[PDB]
Amino acid sequence: MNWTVDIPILPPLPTDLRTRLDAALAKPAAQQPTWPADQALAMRTVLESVPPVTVPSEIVRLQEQLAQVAKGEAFLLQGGDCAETFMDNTEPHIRGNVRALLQMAVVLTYGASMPVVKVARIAGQYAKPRSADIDALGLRSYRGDMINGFAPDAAAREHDPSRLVRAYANASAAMNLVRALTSSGLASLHLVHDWNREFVRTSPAGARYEALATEIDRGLRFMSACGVADRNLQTAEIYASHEALVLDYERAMLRLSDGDDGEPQLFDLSAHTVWIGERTRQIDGAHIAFAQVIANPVGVKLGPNMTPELAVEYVERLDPHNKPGRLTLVSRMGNHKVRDLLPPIVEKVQATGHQVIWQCDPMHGNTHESFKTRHFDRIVDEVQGFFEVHRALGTHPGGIHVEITGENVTECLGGAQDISETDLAGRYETACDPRLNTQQSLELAFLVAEMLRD
Template identity: 45%
Template sequence: MKFSTLASSVLLLAFSADAFTPTSLVRTSTALNVAAEPPSTSAASGEWSPESWKSKVASQMPVYDDEAELDDAVNRLKRCSPLVFAGEVRALHEQLARACHGQGFLLMGGDCAEAFNEFNVDHVRDSFRVILQMALVLTFGSAMPVIKVGRMAGQFAKPRSEPDEVRGDVSLPSYRGDIINSEEFTAEARRNNPHNMVEAYHQSAQTLNILRAFATGGYADISRLQAWNLDFVEQTEEGSRYRKFATKVDESLRFMKAIGVDTSSDTFAKTDFFTAHECLLLPYEQALTRKDSTTGKWYDCSAHMLWVGERTRELDGAHLEFTRGIGNPLGVKISDKCTPEELLNICDTMNPNNTPGKLTIIVRMGAEKLRKNLPGLIRAVQREGKSVIWISDPVHGNTRKTDNGFKTRDFDNIRAELRAFFDVHEEMGSHPGGVHLEMTGEDVTECTGGVSDVTEETLADRYNTYCDPRLNGSQALEIAFLIAERMRKRSGLPPIE
């Protein structure tokens, strides 16, 4: 790679100036007028409230057997402080607005589902630093800021295909994530317990405290990027590739320091890092929705960004009713089942003012279906002038079950869907705005293939997920290099070597 110190320094400045700006707990947003976004007509006329979703049909919701117990849990959450703040949400919205105009790339990653008994600082740190590694590689590949969003601090609930799980002659409610019930197959564990929401809140608060400390306390200092490598990733081809890449960036830092750039400033030492989760358990989301004192707008303060899943995005359903009234950036997952007309109606509902950065379309189809269906969806959005960010979720549409009973995803299929996503956007002249991955910084064996060489026979070695299989750290980094290569080719830049 002919990666000269001067050229890499220019890229590093771009990386630092936008992707590594200090995070403050309260920050106003004016550059793109995001804070001035008007509320939707229906919300302004008083038809929307944090509770108005109750008038709609709510899919994938647990049934609680004690209404008084549910009310008590919701009231306890209402008295809790916000997990995130309106100023932080507006900061994310501002960055997403730039990505909507082709001036940024959204990286979303994290656990399929968080678990109470898996919580520890090391797990949060390892996932955080893999995302930092990926962001650095993607910044070099795209030559644009990378927006880092973790599926963390709230990703506890999961939709289920069946309401009940049957084992032999015993039928119990399906496990829906720790925020609702427990995985153990007993009647007591599978009872939908509303007080799990309170425990989820407190664990989320701890996770956010850790993330804020890592993002602003020196861990994310770009001069430490050699220390970001995970031990098990270090032994892989991609780990070695990252190490060489990091050495080049180190050279750039020394060059910048030599010409008078202060590389010890907050610009290089801190990073913006945001959180997101699926907006699924509406009593929890409602309880943490607050009115911002500076703008008068409602924000769901459980996360910076919320998305609505493929199974809950009904136009007349409770989840779209709830999300249409909050000021957070939103996402919606779509499969090949989504028609162009339906997508346009979703855009009108979730982003009635067509505000840039407000709505992200998360595409999960599988490679073949994506090539067939995505062009028509993009064409409809372009024709109607809708402002959206298109990002790929290449893992969800590629899940299968092995003969020995493990749910897994094949790296080759994930790569094929990513390739199809970029091919279609190249054909349509649209911006491939990001990627959404179920991943972890741990050395798990849950997805087959990639440089880590996980096979069906080795899945049982470290299959630790409570829900769906995740990419491990080396597989996630390999994905980042693949995307970076594709984006450099798209821009006419030389490949990474």
């Protein structure tokens, strides 16, 4: 019960790009799968000839849109599953996650009074880092479906390089549907807002969000009243992102491009934008060096051990040309620490004259065990603290990065539903970290819109 692909038996990379890529990949790389080199090379050779998930002109367009974010003239929303799985890579699940992100985007667009750049964790979020090799059950840790299987048995946890090709197949299939959905009616502003209005009338805390929902509704109707050309309301752009973790995968998805802008560059065409996590951001490591040789916008996760001085080193290495929006610094401090730890980092980075996007990840600093879980109020409070830090400094609170789903899961405590510890057992479906369910993600949008409205 296998499908079977052939290992395929152009002009070479420009000499300098080959040199730089090899140098980047020769550096130490944390959190890599352990599979045979010959097998990995077979899979890379397959992936080097597949159609790309994204194309360079979209990445250049995203860079332009992110430059507006960095300049204080747009807001970045990034969200989706903590981990995609091959099993749940289905039309309803994709449709649900795209809907949940669009619903947030409407509320955040209105609240920010500026465009929102909408970036899904989708079409490649198939690899995760682990602090431990051996898990709580004594098994080799699950590292996402690009590496091994979620099932709790030894054979499933074996690192399988064929998962590189399965991950690409699943990613391009998802991406095709995201494109179709967003261009063909799912992203109609009016339809998306109708879902928000239904949330407000059926949610336990709907009375809380009714006033802002109605103001949004009246804002939408005002556009029709004014006779606005409305094609821009019928569709939205949803960009693809994931953590750039498995370097066998990312290097195989590199393509060379440019006869539009000056010189040929390497673009990672597995996504539009990628980020480097806490456990793989070693300053002299392969992940950061790889990010230096690709043209895509990138982000780096910054946790509570971050110094102002290291943050500047990231900026100087990853934004060497001072291109607004090329670099996003993703704060994940914990709600109890963000107000204290973030200001000195922001000050020192702003003093460089570079314009990064400051993005809040309020998930990864606020996890505990009841089930691995997160309380909704701590999530909300970290974004609140993040906004306070920026208001005090006159800097731009540029966006959020959240883990969400359109599914009615029971993974995070709280929200208007008041999800309890005993409730968690009902629909705890994440392959990894607890996600805000569709209602909690929308509620967070409304709360953040009020922080924006200030």
